[PDB]
RNA sequence: AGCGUUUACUUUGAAAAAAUUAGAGUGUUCAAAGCAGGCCGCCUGGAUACCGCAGCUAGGAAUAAUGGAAUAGGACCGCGG
């Protein structure tokens, strides 16, 4: 079940058996890569790029049409963001909560939810440190967390 | 000819005859635009169950998709030339041995037995892509891989099932049965 | 979380056999489960089974014959030396006639009687009688 | 019931079951060629879009995103496509 | 059930349920021994031979005696395979 | 003669004080013991097994960790140095 909640949600994507590409799709490997570049250049994360592609163009996976995954494509061309786009969203969330908590000091619930979010930041940050996609110096501390976008 | 054999050795009279037949087909037919830089690696000929025979061709893995594009249009006039036989293209995958304790980089997981054998079966049934697999473990101990093939190209390739079963039993040494399901597409 | 996969697979067979079901779908298929079930089949406690490939961990459908009293697992995988295989097969199995301790050795996954014959100790997986 | 073929279930059972709990999981969604009456052209839209898909050069809105499936605009011929 | 020599030693051999393949205990009083009559093919009349089935106590009170008798009969070809 | 990602695991071998325990022989008159004895000068004996763990050694490669190219300082192949 959920890491920081009592919920037991069974609701995710279910890829088809067939890893093959469909007949109707006329977009090629390089055509999709060219559009992946343009979407990311406009200012867009690997989650949003994959959504915009398969809603409008009809690209079940980039991995099946092309050879590689979206971030893997981006960080080859050199368009990939510095810290990952899931640790980014967790930090930005922690900033928004902590700013709201600055004014509303009597909010004991916001205080408790900040502890769960910052606990989840610490937990994911060290995974990335072992895999070496963060410098081992890297330290999330709230005072110099607002400056990290 | 158009056969670039991997070892600097002799494309034997059998493999030569097919490489020359492909040069002639090029020079005569319309799809000579494609057959400029496409090549053969080798070409054996097996005896399939019954009283039938299946000529088999090998391809450089890079230019496989280039063959795949024209594979069904080409195989027709190969079978019209070599009358009472079946023909099917397969890519020559390199296969590295499991690195034992006794004794050069990390073996990529495409250069391994299970992945190569999965890729061999993928290319056997080219026009009809695979939609299912069931490995029946029989009571003696032996296995039986049961492949469900896409119901499009059923009528086109249902007569090649024993060819595919025989070719795969030869290349790998595993017993396979190709079925056509009615309940998905 | 799902720590042990063989533990789940053998509890699933055991529950289905008691309830009197004729076949059971044990989910997270692995080399260790298949190699366990081949041994179990070769002595003739289960029937023929069919392993179902989705591009993930596979599934297994085991055709059940009503001749399986218990199929259990030992966790952790204790390191059974050859001389101590007596005291193990003494306190796990019903009698000295029938029942098997299957243990993973140097050679491969095989029952106590085979491992005794081949002159190999190894790590215990489970038992079936 | 003791005897049920878990290997060969009839397709009404699998279409009933949750997408993850079928004998081999498969998506409940699909792709469909949708065209507005004015223009000549057919644009691929995903069943569960979750973005406002536009006809080329901002001609008009084509589908509206909801909780589950996307509301296609009133006056649009959709043909769900198969592979 | 015989010794080293080969002499069958136990004082009787219990029956096994046709559905579950359990041994029917010496005092399993809800166990049945049901003879379904065998019929001449051309006339549709009783021959004087029968296709006998045994079922365990647990199976009956489970409520699977009906389907198990049915499936045994349909396997023998007493009930039509079409059904 | 020299080699060969590492370790845990299992099997073999080496080295392991006697006494004690298990145990082969032997009518202490039987036995507990004892290491004696037996044959009409001679023939025997004073065995063997166990001694966790750690260290040492040589086979096995299932299971369980760990490692190898991804701003390519990649392996191999040869020339220029």
UniProtKB/Swiss-Prot annotation, chain A:
<feature type="modified residue" description="Phosphoserine">
    <location>
        <position position="29"/>
    </location>
</feature>
<keyword id="KW-0832">Ubl conjugation</keyword>
<dbReference type="InterPro" id="IPR000589">
    <property type="entry name" value="Ribosomal_uS15"/>
</dbReference>
<dbReference type="InterPro" id="IPR012606">
    <property type="entry name" value="Ribosomal_uS15_N"/>
</dbReference>
<keyword id="KW-0007">Acetylation</keyword>
<dbReference type="GO" id="GO:0006412">
    <property type="term" value="P:translation"/>
</dbReference>
<keyword id="KW-0539">Nucleus</keyword>
<feature type="modified residue" description="N6-succinyllysine; alternate">
    <location>
        <position position="26"/>
    </location>
</feature>
<keyword id="KW-1017">Isopeptide bond</keyword>
<keyword id="KW-0689">Ribosomal protein</keyword>
<dbReference type="Pfam" id="PF08069">
    <property type="entry name" value="Ribosomal_S13_N"/>
</dbReference>
<comment type="function">
    <text>Component of the small ribosomal subunit. The ribosome is a large ribonucleoprotein complex responsible for the synthesis of proteins in the cell. Part of the small subunit (SSU) processome, first precursor of the small eukaryotic ribosomal subunit. During the assembly of the SSU processome in the nucleolus, many ribosome biogenesis factors, an RNA chaperone and ribosomal proteins associate with the nascent pre-rRNA and work in concert to generate RNA folding, modifications, rearrangements and cleavage as well as targeted degradation of pre-ribosomal RNA by the RNA exosome.</text>
</comment>
Curated annotation (Swiss-Prot), chain B:
<dbReference type="GO" id="GO:0006364">
    <property type="term" value="P:rRNA processing"/>
</dbReference>
<dbReference type="GO" id="GO:0030686">
    <property type="term" value="C:90S preribosome"/>
</dbReference>
<feature type="modified residue" description="N6-acetyllysine; alternate">
    <location>
        <position position="69"/>
    </location>
</feature>
<dbReference type="GO" id="GO:0042274">
    <property type="term" value="P:ribosomal small subunit biogenesis"/>
</dbReference>
<keyword id="KW-0832">Ubl conjugation</keyword>
<dbReference type="GO" id="GO:0006412">
    <property type="term" value="P:translation"/>
</dbReference>
<keyword id="KW-0206">Cytoskeleton</keyword>
<dbReference type="Pfam" id="PF01251">
    <property type="entry name" value="Ribosomal_S7e"/>
</dbReference>
<dbReference type="GO" id="GO:0005813">
    <property type="term" value="C:centrosome"/>
</dbReference>
<dbReference type="GO" id="GO:0003735">
    <property type="term" value="F:structural constituent of ribosome"/>
</dbReference>
<keyword id="KW-0007">Acetylation</keyword>
<dbReference type="GO" id="GO:0032040">
    <property type="term" value="C:small-subunit processome"/>
</dbReference>
Curated annotation (Swiss-Prot), chain C:
<comment type="function">
    <text>Component of the small ribosomal subunit. Part of the small subunit (SSU) processome, first precursor of the small eukaryotic ribosomal subunit. During the assembly of the SSU processome in the nucleolus, many ribosome biogenesis factors, an RNA chaperone and ribosomal proteins associate with the nascent pre-rRNA and work in concert to generate RNA folding, modifications, rearrangements and cleavage as well as targeted degradation of pre-ribosomal RNA by the RNA exosome. Required for proper erythropoiesis.</text>
</comment>
<dbReference type="GO" id="GO:0006412">
    <property type="term" value="P:translation"/>
</dbReference>
<dbReference type="InterPro" id="IPR000630">
    <property type="entry name" value="Ribosomal_uS8"/>
</dbReference>
<dbReference type="InterPro" id="IPR035987">
    <property type="entry name" value="Ribosomal_uS8_sf"/>
</dbReference>
<dbReference type="GO" id="GO:1990904">
    <property type="term" value="C:ribonucleoprotein complex"/>
</dbReference>
<dbReference type="GO" id="GO:0022626">
    <property type="term" value="C:cytosolic ribosome"/>
</dbReference>
<protein>
    <recommendedName>
        <fullName>Small ribosomal subunit protein uS8</fullName>
    </recommendedName>
</protein>
<keyword id="KW-0963">Cytoplasm</keyword>
<keyword id="KW-0687">Ribonucleoprotein</keyword>
<keyword id="KW-0539">Nucleus</keyword>
<feature type="modified residue" description="N6-succinyllysine">
    <location>
        <position position="87"/>
    </location>
</feature>
<dbReference type="InterPro" id="IPR047863">
    <property type="entry name" value="Ribosomal_uS8_CS"/>
</dbReference>
From Swiss-Prot, chain D:
<keyword id="KW-0689">Ribosomal protein</keyword>
<dbReference type="InterPro" id="IPR000592">
    <property type="entry name" value="Ribosomal_eS27"/>
</dbReference>
<dbReference type="Pfam" id="PF01667">
    <property type="entry name" value="Ribosomal_S27e"/>
</dbReference>
<keyword id="KW-0597">Phosphoprotein</keyword>
<dbReference type="InterPro" id="IPR023407">
    <property type="entry name" value="Ribosomal_eS27_Zn-bd_dom_sf"/>
</dbReference>
<dbReference type="GO" id="GO:0003735">
    <property type="term" value="F:structural constituent of ribosome"/>
</dbReference>
<dbReference type="GO" id="GO:0022626">
    <property type="term" value="C:cytosolic ribosome"/>
</dbReference>
<comment type="subunit">
    <text>Component of the small ribosomal subunit. Part of the small subunit (SSU) processome, composed of more than 70 proteins and the RNA chaperone small nucleolar RNA (snoRNA) U3.</text>
</comment>
<comment type="function">
    <text>Component of the small ribosomal subunit. The ribosome is a large ribonucleoprotein complex responsible for the synthesis of proteins in the cell. Required for proper rRNA processing and maturation of 18S rRNAs. Part of the small subunit (SSU) processome, first precursor of the small eukaryotic ribosomal subunit.</text>
</comment>
<protein>
    <recommendedName>
        <fullName>Small ribosomal subunit protein eS27</fullName>
    </recommendedName>
</protein>
<dbReference type="GO" id="GO:0008270">
    <property type="term" value="F:zinc ion binding"/>
</dbReference>
<feature type="modified residue" description="Phosphoserine">
    <location>
        <position position="10"/>
    </location>
</feature>
């Amino acid at each position: 079940g959920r890491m920081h909640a009592p919920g037991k949600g069974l609701s995710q994507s279910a890829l088809p058996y067939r890893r093959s590409v469909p007949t109707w799709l006329k977009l090629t490997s390089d055509d999709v890569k060219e559009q992946i570049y343009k979407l990311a250049k406009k200012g867009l994360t690997p989650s949003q790029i994959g959504v915009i592609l398969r809603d409008s163009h009809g690209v079940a996976q980039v991995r099946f049409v092309t050879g590689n995954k979206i971030l893997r494509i981006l960080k080859s061309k050199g368009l990939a963001p510095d810290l990952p786009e899931d640790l980014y969203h967790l930090i930005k969330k922690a900033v928004a909560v902590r700013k709201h908590l600055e004014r509303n000091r009597k909010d004991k619930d916001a205080k408790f939810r900040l502890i769960l979010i910052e606990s989840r930041i610490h937990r994911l940050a060290r995974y990335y440190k072992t895999k070496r996609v963060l410098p081992p110096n890297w330290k999330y501390e709230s005072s110099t967390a607002s400056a990290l976008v | 000819a158009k056969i670039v054999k991997p070892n600097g050795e002799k494309p034997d009279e059998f493999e030569s005859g097919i490489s020359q037949a492909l040069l002639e087909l090029e020079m005569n037919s319309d799809l000579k635009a494609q057959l400029r830089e496409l090549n053969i690696t080798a070409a054996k000929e097996i005896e399939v169950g019954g009283g039938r025979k299946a000529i088999i061709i090998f391809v450089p893995v890079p230019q496989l998709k280039s063959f795949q594009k024209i594979q069904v249009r080409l195989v027709r006039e190969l079978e019209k030339k070599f009358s009472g036989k079946h023909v099917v293209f397969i890519a020559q995958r390199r296969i590295l041995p499991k690195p034992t304790r006794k004794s050069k980089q990390k073996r990529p997981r495409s250069r391994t037995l299970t992945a190569v054998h999965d890729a061999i079966l993928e290319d056997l049934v080219f026009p009809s892509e695979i939609v299912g697999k069931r490995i029946r473990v029989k009571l003696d101990g032996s296995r039986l891989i049961k492949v469900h093939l896409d119901k499009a190209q059923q009528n086109n390739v249902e007569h090649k099932v024993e060819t595919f079963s025989g070719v795969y039993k030869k290349l790998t040494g595993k017993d396979v049965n190709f079925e056509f399901p009615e309940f998905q597409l | 979380v799902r720590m042990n996969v063989l533990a789940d697979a053998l509890k699933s067979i055991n529950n289905a056999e008691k309830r009197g079901k004729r076949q059971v779908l044990i989910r997270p298929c692995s080399k260790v489960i298949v190699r366990f079930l081949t041994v179990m089949m070769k002595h003739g406690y289960i029937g023929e089974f069919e392993i179902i490939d989705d591009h993930r961990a596979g599934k297994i459908v085991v055709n059940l014959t009503g001749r399986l009293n218990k199929c259990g697992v030992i966790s952790p995988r204790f390191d059974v030396q050859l001389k101590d295989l007596e005291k193990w097969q003494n306190n796990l199995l019903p009698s000295r006639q029938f029942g098997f301790i299957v243990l993973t050795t140097s050679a491969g996954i095989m029952d106590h009687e085979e491992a005794r014959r081949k002159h190999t100790g190894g790590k215990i997986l489970g038992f079936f009688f | 019931p003791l005897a049920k073929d878990l290997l060969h279930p009839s397709p009404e059972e699998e279409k009933r079951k949750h997408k993850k709990k079928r004998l081999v999981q498969s998506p409940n969604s699909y792709f469909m060629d949708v065209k507005c009456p004015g223009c000549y052209k057919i644009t691929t839209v995903f069943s569960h879009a979750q973005t406002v898909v536009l006809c080329v050069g901002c001609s008009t809105v084509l589908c509206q995103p909801t909780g589950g499936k996307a509301r296609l605009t009133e006056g649009c011929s959709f043909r769900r496509k198969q592979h | 059930m015989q010794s080293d020599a080969g002499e069958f030693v136990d004082l009787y051999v219990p029956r096994k349920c046709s559905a579950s393949n359990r041994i029917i205990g010496a005092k399993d009083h809800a166990s049945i021994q049901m003879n379904v009559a065998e019929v001449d093919k051309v006339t549709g009349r009783f021959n004087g031979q029968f296709k006998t089935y045994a079922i365990c106590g647990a199976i009956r009170r489970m409520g699977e005696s009906d389907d198990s008798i049915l499936r045994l009969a349909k396997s023998d070809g007493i009930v039509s395979n079409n059904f």
